[PDB]
Symmetry: D2
Subunit: 68 residues, 4 copies
């Protein structure tokens, strides 16, 4: 799962299945710059958690509630 | 709040009570420079959380665990709700 | 956001786009949903929170980014003053 | 870490250390535990986290030249 763009183009569909089951990023290569394909749920989860880390109480809340 | 080093020297027990009740940091101001007093549990919880965030997959797992139970839900919702206010 | 059919068609232009404006693209499909972002945003996100494990590293990152913008010329000047 | 009664005796040198060393100090006490850190370092930490919300800002943190 570090591949050329032209191959990522043909395999796009299984690559979407993979990213949703694996939850690892796929590094895509090109003359145009590299891209990462990742699952929407991993992306959302990461952006949401970094937003919540704005408030240091929030991590304590989250940690405390898990361990319940 | 924000107070001088000279009064914080006097009021250290009550500022630590405050910091671990209201969870708002206290700026202590002085000739040298200024400092911030906060709750240690807030501080450590933050660090350890960031330690676990090695990759987006870890963020997803942490969101799962929050999704597991009623305790996770309300903690999460409350945090979202504060964030909606500010 | 765009479908996977279309993302498959336009992948090459989407790869250059995502590295030009640096905005991620949401891709929906019957197989599931993905996002496509530049490898640079992705690495920068991961690395930057990893650095932030110690909150003290935030000041250090700001100082490094400022040294970066200032240039090699600011450092040569320091060298010269030290002599 | 240090007790709150040691920290009271030495609050000035402590505020100076924390600004010079750019490392926090843990304070343990009867009223619970607290962390003392440089105000500027606290502010940079809060600001950086705020910023990290976009993957664009993160990119500009990494590729700042």
């Amino acid at each position: 799962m570090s591949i050329s763009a032209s191959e990522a183009r043909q395999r796009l569909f299984p690559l979407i299945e993979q990213v949703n089951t694996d939850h690892q990023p796929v590094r895509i290569t090109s003359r145009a710059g590299d891209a990462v394909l990742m699952s929407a749920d991993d992306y959302d989860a990461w952006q949401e958690t970094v937003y919540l880390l704005r408030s240091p109480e929030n991590a304590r809340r989250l940690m405390e509630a898990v361990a319940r």
